[PDB]
Write a protein that binds this ligand. Structure first.
Ligand SMILES: [Hg+2]
Ligand SMILES: [Hg+2]
Lengths: 88, 124, 127, 90
């Protein structure tokens, strides 16, 4: 249970805006990981530092996506993630 | 012998430090450059080192032990690499994982070839 | 603190211990035909790092020197890609591509597996 | 960059088998790796290891096939003195 809460604030059917509030603890960076819920080969990923909002683009419209936010405090160590299922 | 435990420990410590420093300066969880850098640089130099130590088998033990077994053994890692790849797999990004694994494997092999080659080239 | 003098020491100690163990293993177990001492070290290392990672996420409170000495030092020196690479190339150069592939697969799949079982061992023993 | 297992001899009884022997006094050799396969076709190559002794035996060869035997003389793991090879048909 880290970047707690976590939600989606944006439209276009090709894009999406995640934001979270992750005070104490300390996070080195977050890795955002997203793909079509079903096919695991579709999953992609990008990295955001100790800020608190991300933006995903180039999504297929009307498709069931699964976003995960992994909160890494030191390269290979990360606190438990949060996921969201969202249709574009 | 006791000289040898020292020869290794020194190199091992130097390499391990360099790797770690590299890993601070270059390394995120998304794609671990600091690791790959160390693993590839290591892969290269060991190609060099091996070509030099066959061509001069007369040299004393402590050199090979400190250069190769120590320095290049600590500079490089399979542990970290493995943990980082699994990390990716666990994240679901199998492409990336494969990429990092291929990079790390093919890369190191290549480097070692070029390291051997660079020595065979510069002794003719 | 990330650049402190305790840390250079924590690493150097573990790195030296691992490197020694690897080397000893490499005397006792390893020929040019098939390098067990290397694979042993790389796999044992692969396993323990799975363990270590599971313990250090579950206790992120612990002090720096532990992760630096266990993982960055000991497991970094216990394991090698350099040696592995040189030994594989050695095989290739000898012409024994089967063997090389085998050793590379062993070393790669093996380490990955081990790390999984090392993670699993900890997740199992903290239900 | 110089010659090793100096003196390499091959008896070839049978079209399936082969007896190598050498004499390799000073330098020291930790072990030899004998490497044999159908010349070129590199996946076919197999290999076995002999210590600081001085005679080997290869079996289960395909008859009437062009083989290449190599003896690599390793002094302390990953380092080896230049090899000797033999090409012969079974
Ligand atoms: Hg993860
Ligand atoms: Hg060779």
């Amino acid at each position: 249970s880290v970047p707690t809460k976590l939600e989606v604030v944006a439209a276009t059917p090709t894009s999406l805006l995640i934001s979270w509030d992750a005070p104490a603890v300390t996070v080195d960076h977050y890795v955002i990981t997203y793909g079509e819920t079903g096919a695991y080969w579709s999953y992609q990923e990008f990295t955001v530092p100790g800020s608190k909002t991300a933006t995903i683009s180039g999504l297929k419209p009307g498709v069931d996506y699964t976003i995960t936010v992994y909160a890494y405090w030191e390269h290979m160590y990360h606190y438990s993630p949060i996921s969201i299922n969202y249709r574009t | 012998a006791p000289l040898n435990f020292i020869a290794i420990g020194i190199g091992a410590t130097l390499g391990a430090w360099l790797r770690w420093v590299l890993g601070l300066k270059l390394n995120g969880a998304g794609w671990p450059w600091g690791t790959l850098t160390a693993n590839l640089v290591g892969g290269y130099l060991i190609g060099v080192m091996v070509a030099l130590i066959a061509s001069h088998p007369e040299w004393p033990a402590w050199i090979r032990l400190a250069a190769v077994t120590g320095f290049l053994g600590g500079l490089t890692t399979f542990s970290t690499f493995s943990a980082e790849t699994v990390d990716m797999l666990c994240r679901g990004v199998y492409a990336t994982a494969a990429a990092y694994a291929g990079a790390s494997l093919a890369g190191s092999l290549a480097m070692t070839g070029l390291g051997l080659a660079t020595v065979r080239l510069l002794l003719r």
